[PDB]
Every structure is written in structure tokens, then in C-alpha cells.
Design a binder for this molecule. Structure first.
Ligand SMILES: CNS(=O)(=O)Cc1cc(C)on1
Length: 284
């Protein structure tokens, strides 16, 4: 029984290595990584790989790993797939922990834009969670944390992290992680998966996929939103993505909105993440 070596980048930046039978479904590898992480609330997470075009794809747990990675290396990342709008209601602290680690990467990467004050406040909770109570002995007037807090670090930002860290004396790691999440969950790009696209007129837009629905970013004043309940049918054909928008009261017909994606693979990927978000965040 032939086994393939799998390498998974964990959210703390370390590498987990295991073996699975070469005909294994994605669920097999996912279960091994989740057991390694002592993670029970597995439903919010998944594994990503890079396709032949270097695009991030979700590893489908129902399908063979080899028929997804195809010609590519068996290298993956462990990531949050469904960002909970209500992190307080997750049953375990360790779930909230992995969600914080993902969000810290969302912030440092620039995928999750954040004001100066929120960067400093999120930083201060991470520092409290990881070092515990503020200690002056560690930090002088010229202190710069090992912690990456932001896409661009400034001395002013480091100073504000410390000032807020001082206010958190006695806060437990679980408590600081919950505060991190209560702030992060409010950011306008929290849990928004962005896809480049063109509207039916050729104008360049972003489509955002998240808990509350499909978002269409056209300009800083032209932002459309389709709550999942208002979405009957999601389809793709060639380079095109389509959503069937439910008839308004007393309207005779559904409305159809069409987008142009860069290529057929980009259209399919957007369709799949939409269907998965629609299913997941249909109901409670
Ligand atoms: C605490 N989790 S949440 O995403 O905020 C709500 C939710 C969705 C599903 C499924 O289970 N719970």
C-alpha cells in the first residue's frame, strides 16, 4: 500500500509532515492535521493547495488528493475556511486560538485592512495572550516586538501596542483571544474571500464571499450586497459566473447577474466557494 509524504504549513508557521495512501481522499489528511492540532470544531477549517497556475484552492475532503494536486507537490496550508460571525459561541478556546492565528496572518498580509488603533489593540491582545502581563524589564523606550502586527510596522504602532498591553494586566490567554476576536469580527473585510472579476459591462470589480452573502465592490461608494437567502442559484459557464437573484415581492421574474472571471478555473473556484458558503451559512 503506497503512501505519499504530505507537508502542511500550520497557522503558527511550522510544518507538519505525515503520510497518506496515494489514493486517499482529502478528509484523510485533514483528520490527521486536526488530530495533530487537538482541534475538534473542524467544520470552520480546511486545507489549501496551489494549482498549476499558482492559485490557492480548497482541498475537497470528498475527492482524491491526487486528482486535485494533479502534477503539483503534496504541499498544503491549514486555514480557516468559514470565519464565524460569532466567535464567542464556538464551543472551544482552542478553536478561537486557531482563528486568532489565521486572523493575525490576514492582518500582516494586508488581506484584512485595519486602522492604526485596531492594529495596536489586536496586537496588545496577542501580546497579553502570548507573554502575559506587561513587564517593563523586557520593553525599554526603544522596544520593537518580535510579533508581526501589521503589513507595515512603525515605532508609533509598537508604542501603542505597549500602552494598550499595560491596560490588560491579569487577562488570561483565552480572555485576550476572545477580546481579539470581538474586535476583529467587526472589521468590514472580516472573513471576506475576494475574487477579481469584470461586470457585464467589462468594468473591473471584486466579488467578496462571506457569511452574510456575496459582496460586489465597484467603487468606495458603489458597493452591492446579496444576502445568501436572496440567492437561488449559483452557476458558471466558460469564463462566466452567474447568480440568480430571487424575485422581489410582486415582481414576476428572478433577475440574473453575470460576471467575467479571468479564466474557466477562476469561474469554477468562485462558484464552489459560493455554494460552500451558501450551504454553511444558510441556517443555524
Ligand atoms: C459560532 N459559530 S458561527 O459561525 O458564529 C455560527 C455557526 C454556524 C454553524 C454551522 O455553526 N455555528
Amino acid at each position: 500500500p503506497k503512501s505519499m509524504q504530505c507537508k502542511v504549513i500550520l497557522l503558527d508557521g511550522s510544518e507538519y509532515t505525515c503520510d497518506v495512501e496515494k489514493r486517499s481522499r482529502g478528509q484523510v489528511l485533514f483528520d490527521k492535521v486536526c488530530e495533530h492540532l487537538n482541534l475538534l470544531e473542524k467544520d470552520y477549517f480546511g486545507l489549501t493547495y496551489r494549482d498549476a497556475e499558482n492559485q490557492k484552492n480548497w482541498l475537497d475532503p470528498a475527492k482524491e488528493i491526487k486528482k486535485q494536486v494533479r502534477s503539483g507537490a503534496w504541499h498544503f496550508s491549514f486555514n480557516v475556511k468559514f470565519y464565524p460571525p460569532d466567535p464567542a459561541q464556538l464551543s472551544e478556546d482552542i478553536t478561537r486560538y486557531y482563528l486568532c492565528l489565521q486572523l493575525r496572518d490576514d492582518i500582516v498580509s494586508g488581506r484584512l485592512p485595519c486602522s492604526f488603533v485596531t492594529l495596536a489593540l489586536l496586537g496588545s491582545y496577542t501580546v497579553q495572550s502570548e507573554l502575559g502581563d506587561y513587564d517593563p524589564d523586557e520593553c525599554g523606550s526603544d522596544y520593537i516586538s518580535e510579533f508581526r502586527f501589521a503589513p507595515n510596522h512603525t515605532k508609533e504602532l509598537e508604542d501603542k501596542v505597549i500602552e494598550l498591553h499595560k491596560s490588560h494586566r491579569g487577562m488570561t490567554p483565552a480572555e485576550a483571544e476572545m477580546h481579539f476576536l470581538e474586535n476583529a469580527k467587526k472589521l468590514s473585510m472580516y472573513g471576506v474571500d475576494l475574487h477579481h472579476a469584470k461586470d457585464s459591462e467589462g468594468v473591473e470589480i471584486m466579488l467578496g464571499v462571506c457569511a452574510s452573502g456575496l459582496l460586489i465592490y465597484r467603487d468606495r461608494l458603489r458597493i452591492n450586497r446579496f444576502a445568501w437567502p436572496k440567492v437561488l442559484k449559483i452557476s458558471y459557464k466558460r469564463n462566466n459566473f452567474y447568480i440568480k437573484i430571487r424575485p422581489g415581492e410582486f415582481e414576476q421574474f428572478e433577475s440574473t447577474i453575470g460576471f467575467k472571471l479571468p479564466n474557466h478555473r477562476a469561474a469554477k473556484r468562485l462558484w464552489k466557494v459560493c455554494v460552500e458558503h451558501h450551504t454553511f451559512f444558510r441556517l443555524l
